[PDB]
Design a protein around this motif. Structure first.
Motif, PDB file in Angstrom:
ATOM      1  N   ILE A 248       1.124  64.326 -19.519  1.00  0.00           N
ATOM      2  CA  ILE A 248       0.781  63.535 -20.688  1.00  0.00           C
ATOM      3  C   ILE A 248      -0.747  63.404 -20.853  1.00  0.00           C
ATOM      4  O   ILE A 248      -1.274  63.332 -21.969  1.00  0.00           O
ATOM      5  N   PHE A 249      -1.460  63.442 -19.734  1.00  0.00           N
ATOM      6  CA  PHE A 249      -2.895  63.162 -19.747  1.00  0.00           C
ATOM      7  C   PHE A 249      -3.781  64.390 -19.490  1.00  0.00           C
ATOM      8  O   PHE A 249      -4.990  64.269 -19.322  1.00  0.00           O
TER       9      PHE A 249
ATOM     10  N   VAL B 251      -6.044  63.913 -26.707  1.00  0.00           N
ATOM     11  CA  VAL B 251      -5.051  63.596 -27.733  1.00  0.00           C
ATOM     12  C   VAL B 251      -5.428  64.338 -29.003  1.00  0.00           C
ATOM     13  O   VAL B 251      -6.559  64.234 -29.478  1.00  0.00           O
TER      14      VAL B 251
ATOM     15  N   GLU C 266      -2.415  66.173 -34.155  1.00  0.00           N
ATOM     16  CA  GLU C 266      -1.159  65.479 -33.916  1.00  0.00           C
ATOM     17  C   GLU C 266      -1.303  63.976 -34.136  1.00  0.00           C
ATOM     18  O   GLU C 266      -0.341  63.310 -34.529  1.00  0.00           O
ATOM     19  N   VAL C 267      -2.498  63.441 -33.897  1.00  0.00           N
ATOM     20  CA  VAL C 267      -2.738  62.037 -34.205  1.00  0.00           C
ATOM     21  C   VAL C 267      -4.035  61.881 -35.007  1.00  0.00           C
ATOM     22  O   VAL C 267      -5.095  61.597 -34.448  1.00  0.00           O
TER      23      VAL C 267
ATOM     24  N   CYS D 203      -4.434  54.683 -23.229  1.00  0.00           N
ATOM     25  CA  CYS D 203      -3.008  54.900 -23.399  1.00  0.00           C
ATOM     26  C   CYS D 203      -2.226  53.592 -23.515  1.00  0.00           C
ATOM     27  O   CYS D 203      -1.298  53.490 -24.319  1.00  0.00           O
TER      28      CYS D 203
ATOM     29  N   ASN E 241      -0.396  52.965 -27.198  1.00  0.00           N
ATOM     30  CA  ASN E 241       1.052  53.078 -27.141  1.00  0.00           C
ATOM     31  C   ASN E 241       1.685  51.759 -26.757  1.00  0.00           C
ATOM     32  O   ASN E 241       1.135  51.020 -25.944  1.00  0.00           O
TER      33      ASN E 241
ATOM     34  N   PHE F  49       4.944  57.009 -22.923  1.00  0.00           N
ATOM     35  CA  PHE F  49       3.500  57.142 -22.733  1.00  0.00           C
ATOM     36  C   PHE F  49       2.894  55.982 -21.964  1.00  0.00           C
ATOM     37  O   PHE F  49       2.172  56.198 -20.973  1.00  0.00           O
TER      38      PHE F  49
HETATM   39  C1  LIG Z   1      -2.138  60.459 -24.465  1.00  0.00           C
HETATM   40  C2  LIG Z   1      -1.492  59.782 -25.639  1.00  0.00           C
HETATM   41  O1  LIG Z   1      -1.754  58.612 -25.888  1.00  0.00           O
HETATM   42  N1  LIG Z   1      -0.619  60.475 -26.398  1.00  0.00           N
HETATM   43  C3  LIG Z   1      -0.461  61.913 -26.176  1.00  0.00           C
HETATM   44  C4  LIG Z   1       0.750  62.419 -26.926  1.00  0.00           C
HETATM   45  N2  LIG Z   1       0.744  61.979 -28.321  1.00  0.00           N
HETATM   46  C5  LIG Z   1       1.201  62.860 -29.321  1.00  0.00           C
HETATM   47  C6  LIG Z   1       1.490  64.200 -29.023  1.00  0.00           C
HETATM   48  C7  LIG Z   1       1.944  65.025 -30.036  1.00  0.00           C
HETATM   49  N3  LIG Z   1       2.121  64.569 -31.282  1.00  0.00           N
HETATM   50  C8  LIG Z   1       1.863  63.293 -31.592  1.00  0.00           C
HETATM   51  C9  LIG Z   1       1.401  62.411 -30.633  1.00  0.00           C
HETATM   52  C10 LIG Z   1       0.313  60.623 -28.667  1.00  0.00           C
HETATM   53  C11 LIG Z   1       0.184  59.786 -27.414  1.00  0.00           C
END
Ligand SMILES: CC(=O)N1CCN(c2ccncc2)CC1
Length: 121
Positions: A33-34, A38, A42-43, A85, A89, A95
């Motif tokens: 995840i890390f 990010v 995607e965000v 994180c 989240n 997460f």
């Molecule tokens: C590290 C962290 O906070 N994140 C990583 C993964 N993430 C996404 C990955 C793919 N699409 C949308 C979101 C949001 C949360």
């Protein structure tokens, strides 16, 4: 000068120790995840929430440039990964829970590193 070489030897050895810590810490994130920044594809609004993003890949880049002068600087960046994180989240997400687990398990590694850095100079 000889002093500058000595200093650079110390930094090189710190980097060797911190590289070991970094690999041990990343093992505690098997879901990876890390591992990477990010994604703003995607965000898109991530930077409105988090003003100082961090991730394992970015740490590794600074590490190999011998950019950590001491353990405290390294720990600062590790803490950023976790704290970012746990803010972005919600508590009931995979997460958030992954950060908590990485924090708790990483604590052991960092406890030793603090003593190794202190003892070996
Ligand atoms: C590290 C962290 O906070 N994140 C990583 C993964 N993430 C996404 C990955 C793919 N699409 C949308 C979101 C949001 C949360």
């Amino acid at each position: 000068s000889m002093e500058q070489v000595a200093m650079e030897l110390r930094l090189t050895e710190l980097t060797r120790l911190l590289r070991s810590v970094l690999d041990q810490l990343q093992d505690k994130d098997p879901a990876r995840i890390f591992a990477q920044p990010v994604s703003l594809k995607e965000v898109p609004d991530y930077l409105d929430h988090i003003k100082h993003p961090m991730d394992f890949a970015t740490m590794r880049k600074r590490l190999e440039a011998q950019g950590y002068k001491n353990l405290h600087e390294f720990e600062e960046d590790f803490d950023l990964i976790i704290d970012n994180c746990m803010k972005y989240n919600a508590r009931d997400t995979v997460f958030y829970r992954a950060a908590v687990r990485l924090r708790d398990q990483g604590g052991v590694v960092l406890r030793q590193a603090r003593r190794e850095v202190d003892s070996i100079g």
